[PDB]
């Protein structure tokens, strides 16, 4: 997509070399924002082939409150295997925080149902937020939240969403995170009877790993094809009730895949 | 500052009218980013004279872990008087979450000491964060955190910081929020023997209240002056021992005040 490949050239052009937690080395910039208007088409990158099956099942797993990869295995998705323990547990990462944030007085807050309630009854609230950054449980998480905090907004009967992502692997992770949140905005919008508006991505540390530079210059030499269209075939009775089969991605003709290694 | 007045103009040209919780009326946009290169000077606005006594005592009251308006009255700072209860308490707002985030098992995390030890021992970490958005205590706060989440970054011996502001009153709160976080980077960079880098500001619902249109038009025809420079007179023994008389602002020549009403 035009915004994605321009972000990639910017980290190459203004990036600082940094060492990091995995010992791989990155080129990174700090602070960036881009906007995708979802009425122009589904934001799935076309300059390399992305695996829709993984993007959709991880969202569904998140909306169930799950943090164990058994579900993802039943559906042949392996994106989270290198961080799970001997039992498949990842710790209280995204699903648990979204659906059951633990309070100090022994309650648990379902943040997704709260947001859905706000979008219906008080869409002009400036408090429609989901946070996965729970300071008191960070030490029990296998990997700290990269997509940390997001906010909804309603304006001319269109729902928008802005995400703050504190760490971003541009090549491997960011095509998955842009398509995931785009899908969530369409699902929230269908449940609230709102039109889809913009997805705003904001980044903290936006980096390219040193073992991903050939892949990056390869991809960057390719022209974006027309953006795909998403068809949802059913309106379920709640957001927690969607199935993989309700989603059709139409018109996706991407350039070939580019394999790259994940830094653990 | 140029960045500030262009955002003010963008809100008038592009904002949607919204009825807000105050009932005052707002013109809003959603999603904006501005960066200030702190090497170019202290970003205190000059198109209206800003009150620095309030900005610095409020930030020292926050790093003390205080939520009681008593300390601010002792220093004649009036900004938080109308959300405070009969005893002067605001609930566990900013200072309580920065210095003593309550965990579900009765412990407390001091996020400001964690950030100090992270910047001194692991400057490359992509996780140097403090969050005020404690979902388990939101209903106990007098007003929900507007400046909600921030992150620090170190690249070539320089300290940067990005704020996510989820709700922004452009005429009244935003001048104050920018200089507060600028000041904080200076104090953090001095205690960590780092140079200062950028302050990146990202906003969620960014707005201009209805009863501020005249004051905005009056501010929008003034020319920004050269930015001042911030002098810190002594190096305290910790980030917790700074005092009002420790800071100096040289070269600040603002346009007159501009008085305006706050929506409660
Ligand atoms: C963002 C996000 C979600 N995550 C989590 C996550 C955790 C830690 C991290 N750590 C890190 N340093 N960077 C990260 O970005 C990162 C991301 C995540 C995302 C992407 C990959 C990743 O490795 N992406 C690769 C490979 C995807 C893969 O697992 N997909 C399958 C594809 C199988 C296939 O092509 N199937 C076709 C074949 C058809 C037929 O049978 N022939 C099909 O299903 O139709 C795989 O490789 O097993 C990529 O995008 O290229 C890992 C984790
Ligand atoms: C950001 C921030 C800190 N706050 C808290 C806070 C709480 C609720 C809010 N509610 C709201 N709608 N908008 C806000 O910006 C807002 C901000 C905050 C900031 C500025 C004013 C404010 O009224 N600023 C005025 C007057 C400053 C004043 O106190 N200054 C002295 C002047 C002394 C001389 O003379 C005074 O009036 O006593 C301004 O900047 O014009 C109030 C609160
Ligand atoms: C986290 C998972 C996700 O959804 N998206 C991502 O981009 N990643 C990343 C970012 C970074 O490259 C790494 C996480 O490491 P760290 O905690 O930031 O040190 O995977
Ligand atoms: C919050 C306090 C601060 O530091 N900065 C701000 O701009 N504000 C604001 C924004 C908004 O006008 C109001 C908060 O109201 P709400 O919670 O967003 O509904 O004060």
């Amino acid at each position: 997509m035009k915004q994605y490949l321009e972000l990639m050239q910017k980290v190459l052009d203004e990036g600082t070399q940094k060492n990091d937690r995995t010992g791989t080395g990155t080129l990174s910039i700090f602070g960036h924002q881009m906007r995708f208007n979802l009425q122009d088409g589904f934001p799935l990158v076309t300059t390399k082939r992305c695996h829709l099956r993984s993007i959709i099942h991880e969202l569904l797993w998140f909306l169930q409150g799950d943090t164990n990869i058994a579900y993802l295995h039943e559906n042949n998705v392996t994106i989270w295997d290198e961080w799970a323990d001997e039992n498949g547990d990842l710790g209280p990462v995204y699903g648990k925080q979204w659906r059951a944030w633990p309070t100090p007085d022994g309650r648990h807050i379902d943040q997704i149902t709260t947001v859905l309630n706000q979008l219906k009854n008080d869409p002009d609230s400036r408090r429609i937020i989901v946070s996965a950054w729970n300071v008191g449980e960070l030490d029990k998480m296998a990997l700290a939240p990269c997509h940390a905090f997001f906010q909804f907004y309603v304006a001319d009967g269109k729902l928008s969403c802005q995400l703050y992502q504190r760490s971003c692997d541009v090549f491997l992770g960011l095509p998955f995170n842009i398509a995931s949140y785009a899908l969530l905005v369409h699902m929230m919008a269908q449940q609230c009877d709102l039109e889809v508006g913009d997805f705003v991505w904001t980044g903290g540390d936006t980096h390219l790993y040193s073992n991903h530079m050939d892949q990056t210059h390869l991809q960057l030499s390719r022209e974006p094809r027309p953006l795909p269209k998403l068809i949802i075939k059913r309106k379920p009775e709640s957001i927690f009730d969607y199935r993989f089969e309700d989603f059709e991605i139409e018109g996706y003709d991407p350039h070939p895949g580019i394999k790259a290694p994940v830094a653990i």
Side-chain angles (χ1 to χ4, degrees), chain A:
Chain A
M1 302 171 65
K2 194 191 187 189
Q3 304 85 329
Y4 179 68
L5 301 169
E6 288 166 355
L7 197 233
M8 274 197 317
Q9 194 62 64
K10 186 190 177 193
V11 30
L12 291 169
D13 291 348
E14 290 175 50
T16 308
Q17 218 167 23
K18 269 176 113 209
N19 308 306
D20 66 308
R21 176 201 131 243
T22 76
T24 314
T26 62
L27 258 206
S28 62
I29 51 175
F30 186 70
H32 186 247
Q33 192 179 71
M34 54 199 187
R35 184 174 302 247
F36 297 87
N37 173 176
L38 304 170
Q39 298 249 131
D40 289 328
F42 194 64
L44 181 57
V45 306
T46 63
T47 44
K48 74 167 196 198
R49 189 178 292 282
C50 300
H51 194 216
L52 261 320
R53 192 169 66 170
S54 301
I55 293 163
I56 292 185
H57 277 295
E58 182 194 43
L59 227 214
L60 258 30
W61 170 65
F62 288 157
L63 292 163
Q64 278 307 276
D66 201 352
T67 55
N68 182 300
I69 66 188
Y71 173 77
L72 297 179
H73 278 0
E74 302 179 17
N75 285 117
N76 273 237
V77 172
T78 59
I79 56 170
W80 277 105
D81 290 7
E82 284 102 344
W83 302 279
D85 72 12
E86 326 71 67
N87 300 147
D89 297 306
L90 282 171
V93 295
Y94 316 99
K96 195 268 192 108
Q97 295 314 139
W98 290 17
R99 305 300 315 286
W101 180 286
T103 76
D105 53 30
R107 295 188 304 118
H108 287 268
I109 304 293
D110 181 348
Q111 296 179 78
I112 294 302
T113 293
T114 299
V115 164
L116 281 174
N117 231 67
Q118 294 170 124
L119 283 187
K120 254 214 85 284
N121 298 321
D122 197 14
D124 296 307
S125 179
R126 300 147 183 155
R127 293 168 179 184
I128 308 170
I129 284 158
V130 179
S131 183
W133 201 263
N134 186 156
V135 175
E137 281 189 321
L138 242 35
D139 65 279
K140 313 200 233 153
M141 301 182 199
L143 199 69
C146 309
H147 46 109
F149 181 95
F150 49 104
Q151 186 171 195
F152 291 95
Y153 177 89
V154 181
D156 289 301
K158 291 175 189 82
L159 181 70
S160 298
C161 180
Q162 182 176 187
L163 162 78
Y164 184 86
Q165 183 165 345
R166 66 110 191 147
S167 180
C168 178
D169 173 337
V170 179
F171 185 87
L172 217 55
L174 188 53
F176 264 57
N177 298 133
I178 292 163
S180 192
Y181 275 90
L183 199 47
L184 184 62
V185 176
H186 281 82
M187 293 165 75
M188 290 276 177
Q190 244 213 154
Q191 289 292 301
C192 298
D193 294 309
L194 296 167
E195 279 309 306
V196 301
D198 301 325
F199 174 55
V200 183
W201 181 88
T202 302
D205 185 323
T206 308
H207 43 278
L208 244 10
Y209 282 94
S210 58
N211 61 359
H212 290 173
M213 296 298 202
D214 290 328
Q215 297 86 170
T216 298
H217 285 294
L218 204 57
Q219 190 178 2
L220 207 36
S221 74
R222 317 222 274 205
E223 188 74 25
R225 308 255 260 238
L227 234 42
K229 304 306 180 243
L230 187 241
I231 305 310
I232 300 183
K233 304 225 278 290
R234 183 189 159 227
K235 187 167 164 207
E237 285 271 13
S238 81
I239 193 128
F240 307 122
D241 278 318
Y242 283 89
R243 311 168 304 223
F244 184 72
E245 295 71 38
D246 299 331
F247 297 100
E248 261 287 81
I249 269 287
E250 198 63 67
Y252 184 50
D253 183 49
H255 283 270
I258 307 181
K259 300 284 116 283
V262 215
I264 304 304

